[PDB]
Copies of this chain bind each other. A is one copy, B any other.
Amino acid sequence: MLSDEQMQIINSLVEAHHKTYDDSYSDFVRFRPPVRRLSMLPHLADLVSYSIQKVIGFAKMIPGFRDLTAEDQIALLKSSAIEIIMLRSNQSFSLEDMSWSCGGPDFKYCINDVTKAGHTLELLEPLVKFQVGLKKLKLHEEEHVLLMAICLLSPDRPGVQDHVRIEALQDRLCDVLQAYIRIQHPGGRLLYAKMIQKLADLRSLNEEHSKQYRSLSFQPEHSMQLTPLVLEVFGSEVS
């Protein structure tokens, strides 16, 4: 059983996610159009940048995040943004066609499309496999948003100052998640452990992405196609 405290935490996260994830993907038509070597880079740079703004919006609504210092907020986001984007994208991912279907055909992305922005199958193969395994967990929306919040509030991310406050926030979220599964998730005996392992898979995806980002951003002809927000967030600058 949960307290009205743990309950309002879940309610806050679900509402935060609904305010930051447009199920109609109506803003996608504002992005540089997709073109199916680097033909998809302009469109995907815009898509990723738009997603970063949405992840920041989601984070600002996570209970306790707003009270952290501007420095820790930046620290948590620069480290976790790519992971949250990968996590939140499971909502459009389809096991049927192994693609991220974001509304119309123009915005249905397969492994073929996402390999046209400079990144290799070395990143994309594990990413698609991650989506598949995650989609098979059949997470309730409640567990989905809790997992993103837990991923974001990891005190072991570089640059973090108030470890105690952040660890306290994450431990509370994990407690809420274990209680939610036990009570609301039929046959979810091993789900929490499977969800924690996904966090470990995200660290590995973060590393491979960070590696490829570094290599690519070193070429100005490539980095010039990115947005100022992507350059800030995925960049290596430190507060």
**A9 in the interface (beta carbon within 8 A):** no
Quick one: given A30-B42, A33-B30, are A224 and B229 in contact (CB under 8 Å)? yes
Q: Which of B29, B42, B228 contacts A223 (CB 8 A)?
A: B228
Determine whether the beta carbon of B31 is less than 8 Å from that of A32. Answer: yes
Determine whether the beta carbon of B227 is less than 8 Å from that of A224. Answer: yes
* Total copies of this chain within the assembly: 2
Interface size class on chain A is: 10 to 19
Residues from chain B with a CB closer than 8 A to the CB of A226 are 228
Residue interface mask A207-224, B partner, CB < 8 A = 1: 000000000000000011
A31 CB to closest chain B CB, in angstroms?
Answer: 7
In Å, the complex CA distance between A224 and B46 comes to 11
Determine whether the beta carbon of A33 is less than 8 Å from that of B42. Answer: no
**A123 in the interface (beta carbon within 8 A):** no
Q: Which of A46, A224, A226 has the most CB of B within 10 A?
A: A224
A85 CB to closest chain B CB, in angstroms?
Answer: 17
In Å, the complex CA distance between A236 and B198 comes to 45
**A179 in the interface (beta carbon within 8 A):** no
**A137 in the interface (beta carbon within 8 A):** no
List residues of A (1-51) whose CB comes within 8 Å of B's CBs. Answer: 29-33, 35, 42, 46
Q: Which of B30, B35, B229 contacts A30 (CB 8 A)?
A: B35
**A160 in the interface (beta carbon within 8 A):** no
Interface residues of A (CB under 8 A from B): 29-33, 35, 42, 46, 223-224, 226-229, 231
A to B CB contacts below 8 Å, 16 in the list: A29-B33, A30-B32, A30-B33, A30-B35, A30-B42, A32-B32, A32-B46, A33-B33, A223-B228, A224-B227, A224-B228, A224-B229, A226-B228, A227-B227, A228-B228, A228-B231
